Motif scaffolding. Sequence first.
Motif: not given
Lengths: 123, 123
Positions: A4, A11, B103-110, A38, A8, A59, A45, A53, A42
């Motif tokens: 991670x 990835x 940030x890490x979460x939404x990058x993972x989700x993507x 998941x 992006x 969180x 979130x 944030x 989400x």
Amino acid sequence: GVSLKEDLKDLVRKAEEIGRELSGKLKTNQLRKFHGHLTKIWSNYIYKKKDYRDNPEKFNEEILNELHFMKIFLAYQVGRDIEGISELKEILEPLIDEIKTPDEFEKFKKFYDAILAYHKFHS
Amino acid sequence: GVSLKEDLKDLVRKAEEIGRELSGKLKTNQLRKFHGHLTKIWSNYIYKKKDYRDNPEKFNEEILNELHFMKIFLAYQVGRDIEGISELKEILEPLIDEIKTPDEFEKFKKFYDAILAYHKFHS
């Protein structure tokens, strides 16, 4: 070899190399217990996105605490999947080579049907 | 722990146990293409049953031969199912470990969205 820390861009590209290396092998949409859980996390979130944030404590105890249980249950369930089919494979392989006659073929088929029937029953 | 020389009955008792066990481990349709090859071979045999039971040579070359391919194919399929799901889990697990921040979460989700999408794309 994916992380991670990567941007992006990289990835997403790896995410398609992976999706194709998987496609023939892994039966599609079979990790749906996980995909589902998941999607709920989400949604929770996105819901409170700016609430999260600025609040590492919320969180942690509301989002990533649930990610922690997901990853655990995923491993457990995948682990049991692998044991299951391996067990089934080691049971069936030697029996198939013992089929020498039509009657033995029938006995095999009845045996398989029974495993099948009880597999689907106890669920 | 199982053999076709056992009488049909002690076999389906064992099948009951195996089936029961597999319900807690295996999801219920992991061997679709295998189950399909089997029933096809079975319905082939049933369809010319008397002929097969009267000519062992024909049975050997037309049914037993196919059951041997099936036995080989089961190994292949189970092997692929295992490495498919094991690979996906070994990609997901460490990435989920790394999620500590929004940030890490939404990058993972993507990334996950992309894997899932380039995964359904190829059948």
